[PDB]
Enzyme design. Structure first.
Site, mmCIF file in Angstrom:
data_model
loop_
_atom_site.group_PDB
_atom_site.id
_atom_site.type_symbol
_atom_site.label_atom_id
_atom_site.label_comp_id
_atom_site.label_asym_id
_atom_site.label_seq_id
_atom_site.Cartn_x
_atom_site.Cartn_y
_atom_site.Cartn_z
ATOM 1 C CG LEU A 14 11.031 65.595 57.101
ATOM 2 C CD1 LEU A 14 10.710 64.391 56.241
ATOM 3 C CD2 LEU A 14 12.128 66.436 56.478
ATOM 4 N N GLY A 15 7.739 67.731 59.220
ATOM 5 C CA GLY A 15 6.450 68.346 59.457
ATOM 6 C C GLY A 15 5.947 68.115 60.874
ATOM 7 N N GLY A 17 2.275 68.980 63.532
ATOM 8 C CA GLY A 17 0.854 69.237 63.420
ATOM 9 C C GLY A 17 0.009 68.593 64.496
ATOM 10 N N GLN A 18 -1.274 68.924 64.456
ATOM 11 C CA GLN A 18 -2.262 68.440 65.399
ATOM 12 C C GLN A 18 -2.045 67.021 65.882
ATOM 13 N N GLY A 20 0.749 64.920 65.246
ATOM 14 C CA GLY A 20 2.096 64.389 65.341
ATOM 15 C C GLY A 20 3.105 65.051 64.439
ATOM 16 C CD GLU A 21 7.233 67.002 66.107
ATOM 17 O OE1 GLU A 21 7.086 68.050 66.769
ATOM 18 O OE2 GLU A 21 8.303 66.350 66.101
ATOM 19 C CG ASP A 127 -6.052 68.051 51.693
ATOM 20 O OD1 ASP A 127 -6.440 69.180 51.294
ATOM 21 O OD2 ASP A 127 -4.943 67.876 52.244
HETATM 22 C C1 LIG Z 1 6.429 64.438 54.784
HETATM 23 O O1 LIG Z 1 6.289 63.054 54.458
HETATM 24 C C2 LIG Z 1 7.184 62.550 53.576
HETATM 25 N N1 LIG Z 1 8.097 63.362 53.096
HETATM 26 C C3 LIG Z 1 9.020 62.854 52.253
HETATM 27 N N2 LIG Z 1 9.919 63.657 51.660
HETATM 28 C C4 LIG Z 1 10.152 64.995 51.871
HETATM 29 C C5 LIG Z 1 9.136 65.975 52.308
HETATM 30 C C6 LIG Z 1 9.500 67.323 52.523
HETATM 31 C C7 LIG Z 1 10.893 67.643 52.284
HETATM 32 N N3 LIG Z 1 11.256 68.932 52.471
HETATM 33 C C8 LIG Z 1 10.911 69.632 53.733
HETATM 34 C C9 LIG Z 1 12.139 70.400 54.182
HETATM 35 N N4 LIG Z 1 12.405 71.319 53.042
HETATM 36 C C10 LIG Z 1 13.085 70.509 51.984
HETATM 37 C C11 LIG Z 1 12.006 69.617 51.386
HETATM 38 C C12 LIG Z 1 11.918 66.696 51.846
HETATM 39 C C13 LIG Z 1 11.528 65.339 51.634
HETATM 40 N N5 LIG Z 1 9.088 61.568 51.878
HETATM 41 C C14 LIG Z 1 8.184 60.711 52.334
HETATM 42 C C15 LIG Z 1 7.173 61.204 53.211
HETATM 43 C C16 LIG Z 1 6.124 60.300 53.588
HETATM 44 O O2 LIG Z 1 6.061 59.203 53.066
HETATM 45 N N6 LIG Z 1 5.220 60.719 54.494
HETATM 46 C C17 LIG Z 1 4.263 59.857 54.925
HETATM 47 C C18 LIG Z 1 3.043 59.795 54.206
HETATM 48 C C19 LIG Z 1 2.034 58.880 54.681
HETATM 49 C C20 LIG Z 1 0.785 58.824 53.866
HETATM 50 O O3 LIG Z 1 0.694 59.375 52.773
HETATM 51 N N7 LIG Z 1 -0.239 58.098 54.398
HETATM 52 C C21 LIG Z 1 -1.352 57.726 53.688
HETATM 53 C C22 LIG Z 1 -2.635 58.047 54.224
HETATM 54 C C23 LIG Z 1 -3.849 57.719 53.531
HETATM 55 C C24 LIG Z 1 -3.775 57.049 52.262
HETATM 56 C C25 LIG Z 1 -2.504 56.700 51.671
HETATM 57 C C26 LIG Z 1 -2.382 55.994 50.308
HETATM 58 F F1 LIG Z 1 -3.575 55.707 49.826
HETATM 59 F F2 LIG Z 1 -1.712 56.780 49.426
HETATM 60 F F3 LIG Z 1 -1.737 54.837 50.490
HETATM 61 C C27 LIG Z 1 -1.317 57.058 52.425
HETATM 62 F F4 LIG Z 1 -0.126 56.770 51.943
HETATM 63 C C28 LIG Z 1 2.235 58.027 55.874
HETATM 64 C C29 LIG Z 1 3.481 58.098 56.599
HETATM 65 C C30 LIG Z 1 4.477 59.030 56.087
HETATM 66 C C31 LIG Z 1 5.794 59.139 56.790
#
Ligand SMILES: COc1nc(Nc2ccc(N3CCNCC3)cc2)ncc1C(=O)Nc1cc(C(=O)Nc2cccc(C(F)(F)F)c2F)ccc1C
Length: 261
Positions: A14-15, A17-18, A20-21, A127
């Protein structure tokens, strides 16, 4: 929280960057998950797990919730998969495009609720923008990815790392002072993104252009189709003096009422 690495099946990146992924995958075959893997070397495996620890402590309805972790290189941070991806992308898809201001304001209120809790717990985002807001299948929102102070603030490193100009407060741009108040300013800008269905802020300007004009006291023009009432709430978010900007609680409070109206 630990899970054997075998219970995870990566499927689609999905993503990248610097550091990881981020991959979409399955846990024990049936559970759709999002997995973040640390790129060996990019950063300490310890500082990586810091984010997970914070997540456990910061659980809330409007925040990304930790699901599990893998603590052996390559470390993984697992969360549940949000089907509609990021807010900024969602608002440009056919579903996102047809959303009425009411449904939009409700979402804005959810983010404000998340930010109120963050403010409550003595934390800062750094951010805050639509790109870091995730949307689920039932259109509920969650705040994600706090910005690393290491790469956004003033110190040894950035000394020459930078940030998202168009969303950053004047004080943060100039003196690198990020507080909850600069997250508030940022929220104002995030507000415009929502009402315009994903349009980039300050249409017609480059980043250095924004910076110049901001000094003269320039503020974004109210978007076509943005209620003037909502607009003045944005202006409160962009007050010159940080201590003059409203709290998320008030913002959350005021958004919830436009919505019941
Ligand atoms: C891209 O990461 C996701 N993408 C989707 N869905 C999606 C994304 C894009 C697409 N696309 C791309 C393709 N084109 C169609 C649409 C389709 C589904 N779903 C979940 C994640 C997701 O949880 N990511 C994630 C987020 C954190 C994070 O925030 N850390 C954090 C850090 C500090 C504070 C807090 C606090 F305070 F808030 F607690 C935090 F939480 C950590 C680990 C993970 C894995």
């Amino acid at each position: 929280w630990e899970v054997p690495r075998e219970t995870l099946k990566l499927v689609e990146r999905l993503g990248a960057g610097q550091f990881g992924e981020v991959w979409m995958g399955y846990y024990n075959g049936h559970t759709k998950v999002a997995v973040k893997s640390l790129k060996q070397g990019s950063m300490s495996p310890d500082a990586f797990l810091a984010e997970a620890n914070l997540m456990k402590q910061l659980q809330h309805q409007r925040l990304v919730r930790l699901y599990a972790v893998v603590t052996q290189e390559p470390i993984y941070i697992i969360t549940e998969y949000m089907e509609n991806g990021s807010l900024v992308d969602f608002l440009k898809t056919p579903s996102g495009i047809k959303l009425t201001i009411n449904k939009l304001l409700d979402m804005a209120a959810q983010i404000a609720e998340g930010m109120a809790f963050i403010e409550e717990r003595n934390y800062i985002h750094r951010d805050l923008r639509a790109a870091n807001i995730l949307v689920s299948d039932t259109l509920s929102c969650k705040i994600a990815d706090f910005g690393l102070a290491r790469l956004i603030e003033d110190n040894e490193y950035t000394a020459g790392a930078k940030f998202p100009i168009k969303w950053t407060a004047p004080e943060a741009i100039n003196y690198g002072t990020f507080t909850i108040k600069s997250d508030v300013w940022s929220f104002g800008i995030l507000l415009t993104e929502i009402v315009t269905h994903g349009r980039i802020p300050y249409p017609g300007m480059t980043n250095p252009e924004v910076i110049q004009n901001l000094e003269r006291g320039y503020r974004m023009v109210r978007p076509d189709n943005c209620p003037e009432e909502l607009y003045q709430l944005m202006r409160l978010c962009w007050k010159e003096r940080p201590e003059d900007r409203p709290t998320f609680d008030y913002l959350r409070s005021v958004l919830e009422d436009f919505f019941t109206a």
